[PDB]
Amino acid sequence: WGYDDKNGPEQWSKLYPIANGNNQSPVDIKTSETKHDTSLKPISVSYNPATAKEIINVGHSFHVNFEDNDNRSVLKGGPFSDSYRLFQFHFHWGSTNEHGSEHTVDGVKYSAELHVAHWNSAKYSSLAEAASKADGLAVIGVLMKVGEANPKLQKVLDALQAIKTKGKRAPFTNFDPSTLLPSSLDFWTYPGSLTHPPLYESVTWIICKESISVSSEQLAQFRSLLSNVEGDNAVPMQHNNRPTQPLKGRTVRASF
Ligand SMILES: CCOC(=O)C1=C(C)NC(=O)N[C@H]1c1ccc(S(N)(=O)=O)cc1
Ligand SMILES: [Zn+2]
């Protein structure tokens, strides 16, 4: 699977039928149709920079992975009673500045999107166990709006020169990804899925109301990453965003 016309989102359903499920992500958030929910607690993140482990080129994207052997780095509050353990962050982007976000807000497409992914360590003993369970994953989505260079991205962008081609990986240490989040943690939440195969309907989405910035040149760095292995013909990673999917009558709740 990939993002090409042949192996891309519109074809995913052939091998992964859950693509046509009732809890697929991402979605268009219609602000007129959101339900303000008084029970929602503030989102609480507490990440230890010592849990940062590795940056990896996975061909369709790059990931920054965290040591997840204990509760040093955790998400709490919002719609959750359980504590969720940080394991990864990554981005999505588009071929142009005009699209690239996965979530949209009232039809508006942002240039990119940050995903900070966590697993339910109260109920489950590993990411592998948690990953397929309705209450297994919690992902914070931050919409990224093209404008001023974002200095908080600096360590991440500087690391890409070491993982230019598929499969390449490097230590990525001493980094707290709560530095990338907007200063307001007002959010939307809805029950949904991983936005690429295997598309498990295991994610509680936390979508920040406030966007963070990214420059056109910072976006060019993401797209200058190569999907091919070293020595092969260069194939830029131009985009990796899934189209919005039907709500099929789910409710997006607002903390605000
Ligand atoms: C069984 C593992 O479970 C997962 O969590 C992931 C899988 C299979 N694939 C990845 O490459 N990384 C993880 C992932 C996390 C968040 C999103 S997203 N984009 O935030 O929905 C996708 C994949
Ligand atoms: Zn993602």
PDB file of all heavy atoms in Angstrom, residues 3 63 88 90-92 102 113-115 139 194-196 205 240, ligand 2:
ATOM      1  N   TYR A   3       0.431   5.808  -1.454  1.00  0.00           N
ATOM      2  CA  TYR A   3      -0.378   7.014  -1.728  1.00  0.00           C
ATOM      3  C   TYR A   3      -0.516   7.225  -3.244  1.00  0.00           C
ATOM      4  O   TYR A   3      -1.235   8.177  -3.586  1.00  0.00           O
ATOM      5  CB  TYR A   3       0.266   8.180  -0.977  1.00  0.00           C
ATOM      6  CG  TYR A   3       0.057   8.052   0.515  1.00  0.00           C
ATOM      7  CD1 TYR A   3       1.037   7.530   1.343  1.00  0.00           C
ATOM      8  CD2 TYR A   3      -1.146   8.434   1.091  1.00  0.00           C
ATOM      9  CE1 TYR A   3       0.820   7.405   2.713  1.00  0.00           C
ATOM     10  CE2 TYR A   3      -1.385   8.301   2.451  1.00  0.00           C
ATOM     11  CZ  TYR A   3      -0.384   7.793   3.265  1.00  0.00           C
ATOM     12  OH  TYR A   3      -0.602   7.681   4.612  1.00  0.00           O
ATOM     13  N   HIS A  63       9.044   8.617  10.880  1.00  0.00           N
ATOM     14  CA  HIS A  63       8.518   8.520  12.250  1.00  0.00           C
ATOM     15  C   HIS A  63       9.600   8.906  13.259  1.00  0.00           C
ATOM     16  O   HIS A  63      10.784   8.652  13.020  1.00  0.00           O
ATOM     17  CB  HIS A  63       8.042   7.091  12.529  1.00  0.00           C
ATOM     18  CG  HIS A  63       6.889   6.644  11.714  1.00  0.00           C
ATOM     19  ND1 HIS A  63       6.609   5.313  11.550  1.00  0.00           N
ATOM     20  CD2 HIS A  63       5.963   7.330  11.005  1.00  0.00           C
ATOM     21  CE1 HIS A  63       5.520   5.181  10.812  1.00  0.00           C
ATOM     22  NE2 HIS A  63       5.099   6.408  10.457  1.00  0.00           N
ATOM     23  N   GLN A  88       5.091   7.673  19.538  1.00  0.00           N
ATOM     24  CA  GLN A  88       5.579   8.134  18.227  1.00  0.00           C
ATOM     25  C   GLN A  88       4.990   9.505  17.937  1.00  0.00           C
ATOM     26  O   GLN A  88       3.833   9.729  18.340  1.00  0.00           O
ATOM     27  CB  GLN A  88       5.138   7.127  17.154  1.00  0.00           C
ATOM     28  CG  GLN A  88       5.471   7.508  15.722  1.00  0.00           C
ATOM     29  CD  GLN A  88       5.008   6.434  14.767  1.00  0.00           C
ATOM     30  OE1 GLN A  88       5.541   5.308  14.742  1.00  0.00           O
ATOM     31  NE2 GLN A  88       4.021   6.775  13.964  1.00  0.00           N
ATOM     32  N   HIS A  90       4.679  11.846  14.054  1.00  0.00           N
ATOM     33  CA  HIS A  90       4.945  11.936  12.611  1.00  0.00           C
ATOM     34  C   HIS A  90       4.065  13.039  12.011  1.00  0.00           C
ATOM     35  O   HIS A  90       3.212  13.659  12.740  1.00  0.00           O
ATOM     36  CB  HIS A  90       4.733  10.582  11.921  1.00  0.00           C
ATOM     37  CG  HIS A  90       3.313  10.114  12.002  1.00  0.00           C
ATOM     38  ND1 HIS A  90       2.878   9.142  12.904  1.00  0.00           N
ATOM     39  CD2 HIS A  90       2.227  10.524  11.315  1.00  0.00           C
ATOM     40  CE1 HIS A  90       1.556   8.974  12.728  1.00  0.00           C
ATOM     41  NE2 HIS A  90       1.152   9.828  11.746  1.00  0.00           N
ATOM     42  N   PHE A  91       4.269  13.291  10.731  1.00  0.00           N
ATOM     43  CA  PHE A  91       3.559  14.366  10.015  1.00  0.00           C
ATOM     44  C   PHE A  91       2.898  13.753   8.797  1.00  0.00           C
ATOM     45  O   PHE A  91       3.316  12.662   8.327  1.00  0.00           O
ATOM     46  CB  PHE A  91       4.465  15.534   9.624  1.00  0.00           C
ATOM     47  CG  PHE A  91       5.247  16.157  10.739  1.00  0.00           C
ATOM     48  CD1 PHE A  91       6.430  15.589  11.179  1.00  0.00           C
ATOM     49  CD2 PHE A  91       4.751  17.245  11.434  1.00  0.00           C
ATOM     50  CE1 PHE A  91       7.134  16.153  12.227  1.00  0.00           C
ATOM     51  CE2 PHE A  91       5.454  17.803  12.487  1.00  0.00           C
ATOM     52  CZ  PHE A  91       6.651  17.261  12.874  1.00  0.00           C
ATOM     53  N   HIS A  92       1.888  14.477   8.300  1.00  0.00           N
ATOM     54  CA  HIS A  92       1.375  14.309   6.933  1.00  0.00           C
ATOM     55  C   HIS A  92       1.445  15.650   6.203  1.00  0.00           C
ATOM     56  O   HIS A  92       1.442  16.753   6.857  1.00  0.00           O
ATOM     57  CB  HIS A  92      -0.051  13.754   6.961  1.00  0.00           C
ATOM     58  CG  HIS A  92      -0.212  12.472   7.688  1.00  0.00           C
ATOM     59  ND1 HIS A  92      -0.397  11.267   7.013  1.00  0.00           N
ATOM     60  CD2 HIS A  92      -0.323  12.198   9.001  1.00  0.00           C
ATOM     61  CE1 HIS A  92      -0.590  10.310   7.904  1.00  0.00           C
ATOM     62  NE2 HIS A  92      -0.561  10.840   9.111  1.00  0.00           N
ATOM     63  N   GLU A 102      -4.775  16.098   7.015  1.00  0.00           N
ATOM     64  CA  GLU A 102      -5.689  14.942   6.870  1.00  0.00           C
ATOM     65  C   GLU A 102      -7.067  15.424   7.314  1.00  0.00           C
ATOM     66  O   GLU A 102      -8.021  15.369   6.485  1.00  0.00           O
ATOM     67  CB  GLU A 102      -5.155  13.728   7.647  1.00  0.00           C
ATOM     68  CG  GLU A 102      -3.879  13.166   7.023  1.00  0.00           C
ATOM     69  CD  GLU A 102      -3.635  11.687   7.261  1.00  0.00           C
ATOM     70  OE1 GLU A 102      -3.541  11.311   8.448  1.00  0.00           O
ATOM     71  OE2 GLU A 102      -3.597  10.930   6.261  1.00  0.00           O
ATOM     72  N   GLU A 113      -0.070  18.175   8.808  1.00  0.00           N
ATOM     73  CA  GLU A 113      -0.699  17.805  10.094  1.00  0.00           C
ATOM     74  C   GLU A 113       0.302  17.003  10.923  1.00  0.00           C
ATOM     75  O   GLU A 113       0.992  16.167  10.347  1.00  0.00           O
ATOM     76  CB  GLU A 113      -1.997  17.073   9.816  1.00  0.00           C
ATOM     77  CG  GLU A 113      -2.796  16.733  11.082  1.00  0.00           C
ATOM     78  CD  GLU A 113      -4.220  16.273  10.757  1.00  0.00           C
ATOM     79  OE1 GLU A 113      -4.729  16.697   9.688  1.00  0.00           O
ATOM     80  OE2 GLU A 113      -4.816  15.484  11.559  1.00  0.00           O
ATOM     81  N   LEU A 114       0.412  17.358  12.195  1.00  0.00           N
ATOM     82  CA  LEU A 114       1.226  16.649  13.226  1.00  0.00           C
ATOM     83  C   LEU A 114       0.324  15.659  13.974  1.00  0.00           C
ATOM     84  O   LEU A 114      -0.768  16.046  14.442  1.00  0.00           O
ATOM     85  CB  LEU A 114       1.852  17.681  14.171  1.00  0.00           C
ATOM     86  CG  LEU A 114       2.427  17.098  15.463  1.00  0.00           C
ATOM     87  CD1 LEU A 114       3.692  16.318  15.155  1.00  0.00           C
ATOM     88  CD2 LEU A 114       2.705  18.202  16.465  1.00  0.00           C
ATOM     89  N   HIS A 115       0.803  14.430  14.126  1.00  0.00           N
ATOM     90  CA  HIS A 115       0.160  13.333  14.901  1.00  0.00           C
ATOM     91  C   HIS A 115       1.100  12.866  16.013  1.00  0.00           C
ATOM     92  O   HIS A 115       2.249  12.534  15.700  1.00  0.00           O
ATOM     93  CB  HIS A 115      -0.169  12.175  13.962  1.00  0.00           C
ATOM     94  CG  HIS A 115      -1.308  12.474  13.051  1.00  0.00           C
ATOM     95  ND1 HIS A 115      -1.527  11.758  11.882  1.00  0.00           N
ATOM     96  CD2 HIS A 115      -2.240  13.464  13.093  1.00  0.00           C
ATOM     97  CE1 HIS A 115      -2.580  12.284  11.270  1.00  0.00           C
ATOM     98  NE2 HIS A 115      -3.034  13.315  11.992  1.00  0.00           N
ATOM     99  N   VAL A 139      -4.594   9.808  19.652  1.00  0.00           N
ATOM    100  CA  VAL A 139      -3.685  10.573  18.756  1.00  0.00           C
ATOM    101  C   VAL A 139      -4.125  12.031  18.809  1.00  0.00           C
ATOM    102  O   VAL A 139      -5.317  12.312  18.606  1.00  0.00           O
ATOM    103  CB  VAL A 139      -3.625  10.049  17.309  1.00  0.00           C
ATOM    104  CG1 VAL A 139      -2.601  10.825  16.487  1.00  0.00           C
ATOM    105  CG2 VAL A 139      -3.328   8.556  17.229  1.00  0.00           C
ATOM    106  N   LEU A 194      -6.788   4.649  12.581  1.00  0.00           N
ATOM    107  CA  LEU A 194      -5.504   4.989  11.928  1.00  0.00           C
ATOM    108  C   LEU A 194      -5.872   5.496  10.534  1.00  0.00           C
ATOM    109  O   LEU A 194      -6.750   4.892   9.885  1.00  0.00           O
ATOM    110  CB  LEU A 194      -4.605   3.761  11.815  1.00  0.00           C
ATOM    111  CG  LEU A 194      -4.314   3.012  13.112  1.00  0.00           C
ATOM    112  CD1 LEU A 194      -3.545   1.723  12.799  1.00  0.00           C
ATOM    113  CD2 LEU A 194      -3.521   3.887  14.064  1.00  0.00           C
ATOM    114  N   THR A 195      -5.160   6.494  10.040  1.00  0.00           N
ATOM    115  CA  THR A 195      -5.426   7.091   8.704  1.00  0.00           C
ATOM    116  C   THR A 195      -4.690   6.395   7.565  1.00  0.00           C
ATOM    117  O   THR A 195      -4.815   6.862   6.433  1.00  0.00           O
ATOM    118  CB  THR A 195      -5.120   8.582   8.737  1.00  0.00           C
ATOM    119  OG1 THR A 195      -3.706   8.715   8.909  1.00  0.00           O
ATOM    120  CG2 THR A 195      -5.882   9.257   9.844  1.00  0.00           C
ATOM    121  N   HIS A 196      -3.964   5.307   7.824  1.00  0.00           N
ATOM    122  CA  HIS A 196      -3.403   4.432   6.771  1.00  0.00           C
ATOM    123  C   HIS A 196      -3.484   2.980   7.230  1.00  0.00           C
ATOM    124  O   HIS A 196      -3.741   2.683   8.400  1.00  0.00           O
ATOM    125  CB  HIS A 196      -2.023   4.912   6.309  1.00  0.00           C
ATOM    126  CG  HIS A 196      -0.973   4.946   7.357  1.00  0.00           C
ATOM    127  ND1 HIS A 196      -0.518   3.791   7.959  1.00  0.00           N
ATOM    128  CD2 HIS A 196      -0.227   5.967   7.854  1.00  0.00           C
ATOM    129  CE1 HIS A 196       0.458   4.096   8.799  1.00  0.00           C
ATOM    130  NE2 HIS A 196       0.681   5.428   8.744  1.00  0.00           N
ATOM    131  N   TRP A 205      -9.430  10.448  18.636  1.00  0.00           N
ATOM    132  CA  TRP A 205      -8.781  11.634  18.046  1.00  0.00           C
ATOM    133  C   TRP A 205      -8.979  12.821  18.971  1.00  0.00           C
ATOM    134  O   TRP A 205     -10.088  12.975  19.499  1.00  0.00           O
ATOM    135  CB  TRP A 205      -9.288  11.908  16.637  1.00  0.00           C
ATOM    136  CG  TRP A 205      -8.610  11.018  15.659  1.00  0.00           C
ATOM    137  CD1 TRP A 205      -9.084   9.842  15.156  1.00  0.00           C
ATOM    138  CD2 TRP A 205      -7.283  11.184  15.128  1.00  0.00           C
ATOM    139  NE1 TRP A 205      -8.162   9.277  14.321  1.00  0.00           N
ATOM    140  CE2 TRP A 205      -7.043  10.069  14.296  1.00  0.00           C
ATOM    141  CE3 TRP A 205      -6.296  12.167  15.269  1.00  0.00           C
ATOM    142  CZ2 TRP A 205      -5.848   9.907  13.606  1.00  0.00           C
ATOM    143  CZ3 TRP A 205      -5.110  11.986  14.592  1.00  0.00           C
ATOM    144  CH2 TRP A 205      -4.907  10.895  13.756  1.00  0.00           C
ATOM    145  N   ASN A 240       1.303  12.229   1.550  1.00  0.00           N
ATOM    146  CA  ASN A 240       0.920  11.052   2.371  1.00  0.00           C
ATOM    147  C   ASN A 240      -0.362  11.348   3.184  1.00  0.00           C
ATOM    148  O   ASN A 240      -0.549  10.736   4.268  1.00  0.00           O
ATOM    149  CB  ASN A 240       2.101  10.644   3.259  1.00  0.00           C
ATOM    150  CG  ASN A 240       2.649  11.761   4.134  1.00  0.00           C
ATOM    151  OD1 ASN A 240       1.993  12.792   4.364  1.00  0.00           O
ATOM    152  ND2 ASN A 240       3.871  11.561   4.622  1.00  0.00           N
TER     153      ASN A 240
HETATM  154 ZN    ZN B   2      -0.727  10.111  11.055  1.00  0.00          ZN
END
